[PDB]
């Protein structure tokens, strides 16, 4: 009859509630009318092609604007002293001083300074001209199309796959490991040795000459013969100019380690070697499980056989195979969990080990990328912990999982939750305690009475890596051991050079200030996990509500009876954790940024002393770096940072607006609207017009969402405005 | 006092408030308007005409001398590190 068509019960709502909820439930296929397992699987599979189409289109546009409105070529010729251009600006509201200030990077008009690091990435892989960027944009536009073509193709009956096909896991793993991971990594190693590395050295190897240009002097033979060391005889000289055939070796596969001294980035030869190396593990690994040829494993049976006799895990993992394969919420929560972990692994390894040329010197880009991925990694983790409860409520079969490791979690759930409470309470009581204590004496003017615990455990790890600072005498920095000498030159000499670099971010110096914050982050992790698992383990029910299983993942509440039951659903527990997640990542990004902007200014001394007490954070970090930001537009002038000053205030406004939906609740607003409904009816010249949807206050759950969205958007945008401007201003 | 299942209307605020006026008309000048306002009375046809009337906005911006689209000229700042 009406929108939403997928929900008839929703479509018959006379109020404005239907339009809202029609949007918020469009992707929840399992709740749609007359849903079948068949319809469920190839809706996702088709929605999957839709997502790919967006990514390729989004990436196509990036290659387009940089080629059309970005200099790039000007950037290539002097990567150190030119600012990359994202795209042009066209805004009628712009005053002349605006068009003025934003004209940068040698552009004919006002543009935006790119902080995505696409310039360094594209330059490192071998893109040298705008023409190259266009061909990529066209190719991605074409890739974006065939994704839609495949999406449309499998929605057709003559090409649609069976659910069982989707549930054949043994073969999907075998291909994804061997093909999706292995081959793609192998193919990339080819681009590196054919284009990236030779493009780095100085030769332009492209489609019209790649067929006639050897990647290596010696033939393809040495690989096939067996002697592969010949691919490492002649590496690039330390004093090598990128994009210049100066001090350029011939080797296409090395393990030098450390950084290319001019670019401060990892060697391309190391990477061409890396991907080639990992491709194999993936390639062999993608041949573990059984398919149609008579050899291979059975995942189920391996899970079945893993039962420790004599307790204490019970039935082990029996029936666990079918619980996962029949539940795509388990799979997603399992996927987000793994993806979320390596998302941070990207953030941690990309600032410590820069992969692209001239990215380490672009301090605004480095800060942005780390902060970017940590918040991305943050939200992903809350999703892995969100599809968890949904699995328990919608897809969990208690009987089929009788006394296995999964079912043993629900029967001692009070143990996991209470100790998470203890660990959270422990960390909080002392981390906050040590902080406040330190502020007291500095107020009292006696900073020599502070509790400054030296992170001696972590410093012991640093010395174990090769850092000759401190007197620890541990592996890779000791007097006699099998570890360092296993270096056998190769990685160690180039890498040990890199670790004792006082300039790079590769293993910075840490102290008492680094101790307190790491505990704050540990507090943030534990508490967030406490909230999320408690929502998961009590998703099917508690003692306050034993039949929570019968109400679904998201419901408003259970009423004011039995003392009150506000925010008792597993959905709300997620919604509460999102707050704690933002706080945690907030502390992480604060800690990363401040320690770096003090390092970049050549003044780590200020961080080492001000980070030990909380007033230092608010003043020497928050207050101190805001001056240039908040003067983006002044009652006297107008700078290029005016965008960020405005967005800074914008973020504050969205943030505070969420507070309205989180503090004030529905019954007040509904009664207010009822008076407004009366008004409109009794007002002449306005009676002629009537609404087609009954005006009602937002729902209890909707408001918690809407408020959280405001809270999260303002949270991000405010810090984004500050992270960029404060860093861009000083550089 | 006065509820009548017979007429459900007066029972409710069905009645038009005395602001209704079903009186006569206005001068014959209408004969003119009815002639020239006819093409816009069709609906849907008018919906389209106005949207394609958005072709005006394109025309007005493609050609516009006095909107800030020029620096006007300056020598740009380097500026924090060039």
């Amino acid at each position: 009859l009406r929108i939403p068509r997928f929900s008839q019960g929703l479509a018959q709502d006379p109020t404005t509630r239907r339009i809202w909820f029609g949007i918020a439930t469009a992707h929840d296929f399992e709740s749609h009318d007359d849903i079948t397992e068949g319809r469920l699987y190839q809706n996702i599979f088709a929605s999957h092609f839709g997502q790919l189409a967006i990514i390729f289109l989004w990436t196509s546009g990036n290659l387009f604007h940089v080629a059309w409105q970005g200099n790039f070529e000007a950037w290539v010729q002097d990567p150190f002293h030119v600012r990359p251009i994202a795209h042009a600006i066209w805004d009628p509201h712009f005053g002349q001083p605006a068009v003025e200030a934003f004209t940068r990077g040698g552009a004919l008009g006002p543009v935006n300074n790119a902080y995505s690091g696409v310039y360094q990435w594209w330059y490192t892989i071998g893109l040298r001209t705008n023409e190259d960027l266009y061909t990529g944009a066209i190719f991605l536009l074409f890739l974006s199309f065939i994704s839609l073509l495949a999406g449309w193709l499998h929605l057709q009956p003559k090409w649609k796959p069976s659910v069982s096909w989707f549930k054949n896991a043994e073969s999907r793993l075998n291909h994804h490991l061997s093909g999706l991971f292995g081959v793609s990594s192998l193919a990339w190693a080819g681009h590196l040795v054919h284009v990236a590395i030779p493009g780095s050295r100085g030769e332009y190897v492209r489609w019209n000459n790649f067929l006639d240009v050897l990647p290596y002097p010696q033939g393809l033979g040495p690989l096939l013969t067996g002697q592969w060391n010949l691919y490492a005889q002649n590496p690039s000289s330390s004093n090598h100019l990128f994009g210049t055939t100066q001090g350029a070796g011939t080797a296409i596969l090395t393990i030098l380690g450390g950084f290319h001294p001019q670019t401060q980035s990892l060697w391309l030869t190391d990477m061409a070697h890396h991907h080639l190396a990992i491709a194999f593990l993936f390639l062999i690994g993608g041949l573990m499980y059984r398919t149609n040829f008579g050899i291979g494993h059975s995942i189920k049976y391996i899970l079945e056989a893993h039962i420790p006799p004599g307790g204490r895990l019970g039935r082990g993992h029996k029936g666990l195979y079918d619980t996962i394969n029949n539940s795509i919420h388990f799979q997603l929560g399992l996927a987000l969990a793994s993806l979320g972990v390596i998302t941070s692994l990207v953030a941690q390894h990309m600032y410590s080990l820069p992969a692209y040329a001239f990215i380490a010197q672009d301090f605004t880009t480095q800060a942005a990328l780390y902060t970017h991925h940590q918040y991305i990694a943050g939200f992903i983790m809350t999703g892995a912990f969100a599809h968890g409860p949904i699995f328990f409520i919608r897809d969990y079969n208690p009987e089929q999982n009788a006394d296995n490791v999964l079912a043993r979690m629900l029967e001692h759930k009070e143990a996991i939750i209470s100790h998470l409470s203890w660990a959270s309470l422990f960390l909080g009581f002392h981390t906050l305690g040590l902080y406040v204590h330190n502020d007291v004496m500095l107020a009292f003017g006696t900073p020599e009475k502070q509790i400054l615990i030296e992170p001696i455990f972590a410093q012991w790890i640093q010395s174990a890596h090769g850092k000759t600072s401190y007197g620890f005498d541990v592996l890779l920095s000791s007097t006699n051991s099998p570890a360092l000498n296993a270096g056998r030159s190769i990685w160690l000499p180039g890498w040990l050079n890199a670790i004792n670099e006082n300039s790079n971010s590769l293993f910075l110096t840490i102290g008492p200030g680094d101790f307190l914050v790491h505990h704050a982050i540990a507090l943030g992790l534990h508490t967030t996990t406490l909230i999320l698992v408690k929502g998961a383990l009590d998703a099917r029910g508690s003692k306050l509500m034993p039949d929570k299983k019968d109400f679904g993942y998201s419901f408003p509440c259970d009423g004011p009876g039995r003392g009150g039951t506000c925010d008792i659903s597993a959905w709300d527990d997620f919604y509460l954790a999102v707050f704690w997640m933002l706080n945690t990542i907030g502390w992480v990004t604060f800690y990363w940024h401040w320690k770096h902007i003090t390092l970049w200014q050549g003044n780590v001394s200020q961080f080492n002393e001000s980070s030990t007490y909380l007033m230092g954070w608010l003043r020497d970090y928050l207050w101190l770096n805001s001056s240039q930001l908040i003067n983006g537009y002044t009652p006297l002038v107008c700078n290029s940072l005016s965008v960020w000053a405005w967005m800074f205030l914008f973020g504050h406004l969205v943030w505070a607006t969420g507070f309205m939906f989180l503090i004030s609740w529905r019954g007040y607003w509904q009664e207010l609207i009822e008076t407004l409904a009366w008004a409109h009816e009794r007002t002449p010249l306005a009676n002629l017009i009537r609404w087609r949807d009954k005006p009602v206050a937002l729902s209890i759950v909707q408001a918690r969402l809407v408020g959280l969205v405001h809270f999260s958007v303002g949270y991000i945008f405010t810090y984004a405005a500050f992270l960029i401007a404060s860093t861009s201003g000083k550089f | 006092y006065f509820d009548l299942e017979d007429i459900g209307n007066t029972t409710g605020q069905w009645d038009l408030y005395g602001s209704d006026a079903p009186s006569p008309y206005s001068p014959l000048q209408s004969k003119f308007f009815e002639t020239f306002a006819a093409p816009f009375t069709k609906r849907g046809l008018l919906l389209k005409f106005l949207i394609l009337g958005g072709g005006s906005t394109l025309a007005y911006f493609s050609t516009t001398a006095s909107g800030d689209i020029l620096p006007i000229v300056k020598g740009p700042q380097l500026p924090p590190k060039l």
Binding site: D693 | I51, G54, L58, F61, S62, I69
Partner: peptide
Amino acid sequence: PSLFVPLVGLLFPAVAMASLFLHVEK
């Protein structure tokens, strides 16, 4: 060139919001 497109990026909301409104009240 680039002064023709951001407005059709604003004609489009006018068109989209109108069409969607008709779709949701139907």
